[PDB]
Design a protein around this ligand. Structure first.
Ligand SMILES: CCc1sc2ncnc(O[C@H](Cc3ccccc3)C(=O)O)c2c1-c1ccc(OCCN2CCN(C)CC2)c(Cl)c1C
Ligand SMILES: OC[C@H]1O[C@H](O[C@H]2[C@H](O)[C@@H](O)[C@@H](O)O[C@@H]2CO)[C@H](O)[C@@H](O)[C@@H]1O
Length: 513
């Protein structure tokens, strides 16, 4: 087993107070003898699922809660079971953020939302609207300054504007069928952003470091950032305020709210130690103070300490932005959603694609898993049972993709029956455990090779062949898991290619009669 027993390794992002966290570790080590190592790897949110899948990684991972449902769905996190008395020390809505499929999958630490950060010496009155920023920038450029710089590389920072006039990720329970990435609100916000770039009020290449340095040196009047940033601003002696984000088309900017949370690796042989550290050392007044003093956490989950911090006007502004925003969903398709929108924003800002092209692709990318599952699940089930699903189907594409797959998929099963049968007789499929062991095979087979529509039809057509078998041996319950497996394999390893082909519209086009 890869993770070492008798110590704690912790991963946390490099913008958080990891020196403070290490101080809490020192205190844990003092009491118990157990060494605590804090690390801050680049791209840790993409690295964790890769390493944890193989049984490796940190004992504890810290991230906003949006990534944790994906982790939990993949079996990477231990269920946490604090008692009533500990649960009652934290705000109920923070626990809701870390609930997935009825189980608690992490400990909530703190509530974070973006705010408008402004230099009070340059801009005694910050703008109320995004619409007035171009004029303010022109005024400021005549004095050697700029109005606003913020990270354009990460969609978390552009999202408040995109969402203002109507963009949304997943509607309201969260409806995974209803995605608002390329609606009219979304387009208007992204367009306003690209116009700021086109008119030289911002630069498409601005990232976290460039924006932070410009603000902290007094060269730009505003930035958009989170509570973590306030420490470095204090160091710089900029006279800053923290306030409400500007409105767009009369409506508030809607930041996605995150709950910084701590999850325990399912492979860790140190779960009792991790729970003891998190509950009795970190999530205490002193523990959170030590972290907070290094980089501010925002509104902490711990009611006792939150009451002390609540008086701070920067925190009050954070909560006001948070109330106008929306708690991020934690569903497993969040990762895909962020990856598509990141790409959309970068390509739109750079002029690689137009706003319409960019957000079209993002909408495709964000809907891809669900749309694929629907198609694949329907085809496997109808093949296995001999009757189609009567529920309505998005709808036109799905219906036509299913019609196409019925032609080409039946061809493949028919002409390749003997290899199919042979490969299904080799494997001793008879229950959910074997199907479990199929993705593995499919992952090494499907990936290793060319990516084209024929190889995709092959995977799905073999899927159907298996489903038929499953039905005859009264293992019908295993079909939907089979469809989820095939779908995951397809959309994880071929996402970029699929988005390039216009998704399933492409599939319909390619095999068109
Ligand atoms: C779960 C297995 C999967 S998943 C999957 N995904 C994409 N493509 C696949 O196959 C195509 C090539 C191919 C086209 C047409 C029919 C078979 C395969 C490819 O990899 O490009 C597969 C196979 C696969 C891979 C190999 C096979 O056959 C392997 C060779 N023989 C060995 C002897 N035995 C009797 C039959 C299988 C068989 Cl029977 C399947 C379903
Ligand atoms: O930009 C997409 C990104 O947004 C959020 O990440 C935030 C994070 O929540 C904050 O703690 C801070 O570190 O900045 C990050 C943005 O760079 C999501 O939590 C994340 O999953 C998503 O990829």
């Amino acid at each position: 087993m890869k993770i070492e027993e008798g110590k704690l390794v912790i991963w946390i992002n490099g913008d958080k107070g990891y020196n403070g966290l290490a101080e809490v570790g020192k205190k844990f080590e003092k009491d118990t003898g157990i060494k605590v190592t804090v690390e801050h790897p680049d791209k840790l949110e993409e690295k964790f699922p890769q390493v944890a899948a193989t049984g490796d990684g940190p004992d504890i991972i810290f991230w906003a809660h949006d990534r944790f449902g994906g982790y939990a769905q993949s079996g990477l996190l231990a269920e946490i079971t604090p008692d009533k008395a500990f649960q009652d020390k934290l705000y109920p809505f923070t626990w809701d953020a870390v609930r997935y499929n009825g189980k608690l999958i992490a400990y909530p630490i703190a509530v974070e939302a973006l705010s408008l950060i402004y230099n009070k010496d340059l801009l005694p009155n910050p703008p109320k609207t995004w619409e007035e920023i171009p004029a303010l920038d022109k005024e400021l450029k005549a004095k050697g300054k700029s109005a606003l710089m913020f990270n354009l590389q990460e969609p978390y920072f552009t999202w408040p504007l995109i969402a203002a006039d109507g963009g949304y990720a997943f509607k309201y329970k969260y409806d995974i069928k209803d995605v608002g990435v390329d609606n009219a609100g979304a387009k208007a916000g992204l367009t306003f952003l690209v116009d700021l770039i086109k008119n030289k009020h911002m630069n498409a290449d601005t990232d976290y470091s460039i924006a932070e340095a410009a603000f902290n040196k007094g060269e730009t009047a505003m930035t958009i950032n989170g509570p973590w940033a306030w420490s470095n601003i204090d160091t710089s002696a900029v006279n800053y305020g923290v306030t409400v984000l500007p409105t767009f088309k009369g409506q508030p900017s809607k930041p996605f709210v995150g709950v910084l949370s701590a999850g325990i690796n399912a492979a860790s042989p140190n779960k009792e130690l991790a729970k003891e550290f998190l509950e009795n050392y970190l999530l205490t007044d002193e523990g959170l103070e030590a972290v907070n003093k290094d980089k501010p956490l925002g509104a902490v989950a711990l009611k006792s300490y939150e009451e002390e911090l609540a008086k701070d006007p920067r925190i009050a502004a954070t909560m006001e932005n948070a109330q106008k925003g929306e708690i991020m969903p934690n569903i497993p398709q969040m990762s895909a959603f962020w990856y598509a929108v990141r790409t959309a924003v970068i390509n739109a800002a750079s002029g690689r694609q137009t706003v319409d092209e960019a957000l079209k692709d993002a909408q495709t990318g964000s809907e891809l898993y669900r749309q694929s599952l629907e198609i694949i699940s329907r085809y496997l089930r109808e093949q296995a049972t001999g009757a189609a699903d009567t529920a309505p189907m998005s709808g036109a594409t799905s219906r036509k993709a299913l019609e196409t797959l019925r032609r080409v998929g039946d061809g493949v099963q028919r002409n390749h029956e003997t290899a199919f049968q042979g490969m299904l007789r080799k494997l001793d499929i008879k229950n959910e455990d074997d199907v479990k062991s199929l993705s593995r095979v499919m992952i090494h087979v499907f990936s290793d090779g060319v990516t084209n529509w024929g190889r995709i039809v092959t995977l799905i057509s073999f899927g159907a062949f298996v489903a038929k078998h499953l039905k005859t041996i009264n293992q019908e319950s295993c079909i939907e898991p089979l469809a989820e497996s095939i779908t995951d394999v397809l959309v994880r390893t071929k996402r970029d290619w699929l988005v390039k082909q216009r998704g399933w519209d492409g599939f319909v086009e390619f095999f068109h009669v």
